[PDB]
Amino acid sequence: MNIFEMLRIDEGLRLKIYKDTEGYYTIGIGHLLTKSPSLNAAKSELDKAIGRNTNGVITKDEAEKLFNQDVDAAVRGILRNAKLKPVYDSLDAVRAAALINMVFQMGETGVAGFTNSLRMLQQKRWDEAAVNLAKSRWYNQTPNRAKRVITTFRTGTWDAYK
């Protein structure tokens, strides 16, 4: 299993414009279109993204394609990010996916704010990191995802996903 499969699980697949849980226009596999309340705006952002006039509708392939860009971007940010990189560097193939899942979900800045958990991970203090991550807003709010990702950092296995 890998980051793609994991996120596809976490984000689901929607081929028609939807609203994320903050009310933001979204599509596909967690592709945020715009933070504008204007549906016209998101449709316009979409067409721009796809390269065609979609009418707020995309194909599974178009989605997979945006998905790929998104994942790549998430990895780059981690890498451009100063708090992140060193953590990414200390993590195994599996736990690295988990980190990436968080960045994708909350953004560079968002993830870089888990100050204690990040040092704990950095130190390979799994359980404790886990213990602490569970004490977040993030987890309270998206407990299903949070839990899986937390179990991922703790075990270094795909169990929570199997």
Structural domains in the chain, CATH included, are 1-162 (1.10.530.40)
For the stretch 21-26, contacts whose Cβ atoms lie closer than 8 Å and that sit 24 or more positions apart, written own/partner, are: 21/141, 21/142
Q: Please indicate whether residue 62 is annotated as part of the active site.
A: no
One of 10, 11, 45, 108 is an active-site residue; which one?
11
Integer Cα distance of 162 and 40 in angstroms = 40
CA distance linking residue 36 with residue 23, whole number of Å: 9
Among the listed residues 90, 89, 113, 88, the one whose alpha carbon sits nearest the alpha carbon of residue 101: 88
Tell me how far apart the alpha carbons of residues 25 and 110 are, in angstroms, rounded to a whole number: 19
Residue 28: strand pairing partners: 14
Length of the chain: 162
11 in active site: yes
**Helix, strand or coil for residue 32?**
strand
Q: Which residues are annotated as a binding site for substrate?
A: 32, 104, 117, 132
Of 5, 10, 20, 61, the active-site residue reads: 20
Find, among 54, 50, 53, the residue nearest to 16 by Cα.
Answer: 54
Q: Which regions of the chain does DSSP assign to beta strands (E)? A: 14-19, 25-28, 31-34
Q: What is the DSSP letter of 22?
A: T
The structure tokens listed for 135 are 């004490």
Q: How many CB atoms lie within 10 A of CB 107?
A: 15
Resolution of the PDB structure in angstroms: 2.1
Distance, CA of 11 to CA of 70 (rounded, Å): 12
Using DSSP's 3-state secondary structure scheme, residue 118 falls into: helix
| Residue 102: DSSP 8-state | H
Experimental method for this entry?
Answer: X-ray
How far is CA 65 from each of CA 18, 29, 69, 132, 156, rounded to the nearest angstrom? 18, 10, 7, 35, 28
Under 8 Å between Cβ of 29 and 11: yes
What token pair was written down for 139? 């987890």
